[PDB]
Design a protein around this ligand. Structure first.
Ligand SMILES: [Cl-]
Ligand SMILES: [Cl-]
Ligand SMILES: [Zn+2]
Ligand SMILES: [Zn+2]
Lengths: 226, 226
């Protein structure tokens, strides 16, 4: 039963808990890392968003995180191909570091294309003003069902800059082949919302430690989300 | 013994021949691929070559390739680490494709730093002028010992453009975590030299087929070799 503690089931031993998890240790592009060495480009965008306000399929606690799953109606388009948004879920603290800076919370937007290839967008939160985009999720977890719309098309800023590289899932089975999009700009979250989200995740950090970095090639990129 | 034929020892089954070879199948950053999506960077790389004329330790046919191995006196410095050149060996046809174009031959310059991390430079050849830099290798494979200097310093152009990304070894054990540098402009080789090198590799292609590409992030970059 894998977790984030430092006992028999912790991240240092995930590989021992099941054969499927062996890549958690043996892989050469495990995530997260500290993003510190990266390149710049003047190339045009290759990322477009096809998000719309959507009622979650489910809002629930699973795999140590608070997760909102969605019907397959939202997509990111990358290199001309659609990747359907499966879920949004949270990590506290944020898992990726950017020039050794941490954030107290991040969201992962998890996508998959028709071929089954994974694309994950990560974005951090900084403690600040109330973020009304989070309220349908907070209201939805403590509610039976009939979940309210999540404003997916208002969640990110208009313009984003992100770090783009290949890595892995940050929880078992740690599958590689992941295209990561780690957004530089933080969203806001209030102290109250931050406490509430952390409590829904059992006040138990669900941040995988940074993994060995085998010269990960990272390009800094921009895109418009509208 | 693994090979490039397609009975019980070839590419599709490398993973089954030894548990050390399992990443040949399970890996999600396997090489080679067709390089066709890449982000252009404008600054000249810090990449520093420390190559000099070097007498091979051995010039020999091993694991389906013509290989020249060296004493550990040559390196590439990348991100402040010295990657020591172990060997130069050949593939026919060239294994990486660039915008779907093939070359009849490539060389791999295989390196490892002290911390054990891999760096391989690939450069293709196109039929044209006689390449004097190949001659000590072509002579050496016909010699018992006392191999003449390979002009490692002259082998590459002073200015190069390359594709840079994370991948794998292209032969078993298919180890990932490889920092790849695939040079854009081909070197020349005469038709006679090309036929001769292919004969020394038993007129038997030693090209791994293109592997699944899980959105490999590739940058295009310039460097100087001195
Ligand atoms: Cl994160
Ligand atoms: Cl190649
Ligand atoms: Zn996650
Ligand atoms: Zn090779």
């Amino acid at each position: 039963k894998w977790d984030y503690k430092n006992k028999e089931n912790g991240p240092h031993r995930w590989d021992k808990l099941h054969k499927d998890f062996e890549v958690c240790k043996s892989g050469k592009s495990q995530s997260p890392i500290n993003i510190e060495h990266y390149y710049h480009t003047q190339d045009k965008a290759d990322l477009q968003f096809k998000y719309a306000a959507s009622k979650p399929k489910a809002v629930f606690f699973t795999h140590h995180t608070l997760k909102a799953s969605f019907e397959p109606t939202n997509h990111i388009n990358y290199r001309g191909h659609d990747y359907v948004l499966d879920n949004v879920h949270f990590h506290a603290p944020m898992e990726f570091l950017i020039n050794n800076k941490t954030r107290p919370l991040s969201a992962h937007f998890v996508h998959k294309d028709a071929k089954g290839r994974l694309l994950v967008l990560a974005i951090g939160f900084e403690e600040g003003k109330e973020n009304p985009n989070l309220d349908p999720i907070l209201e939805g977890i403590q509610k039976k069902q009939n979940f309210k719309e999540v404003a997916l098309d208002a969640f990110l800023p208009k313009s984003i800059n992100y770090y783009h590289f290949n890595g892995s899932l940050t929880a078992p089975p740690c599958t590689e082949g992941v295209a990561w999009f780690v957004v530089e700009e933080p969203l806001e979250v209030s102290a109250k919302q931050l406490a509430e989200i952390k409590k829904r995740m059992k006040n138990s950090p669900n941040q995988r430690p940074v993994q060995p970095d085998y010269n990960t090639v990272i390009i800094k990129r921009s895109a418009e989300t509208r």
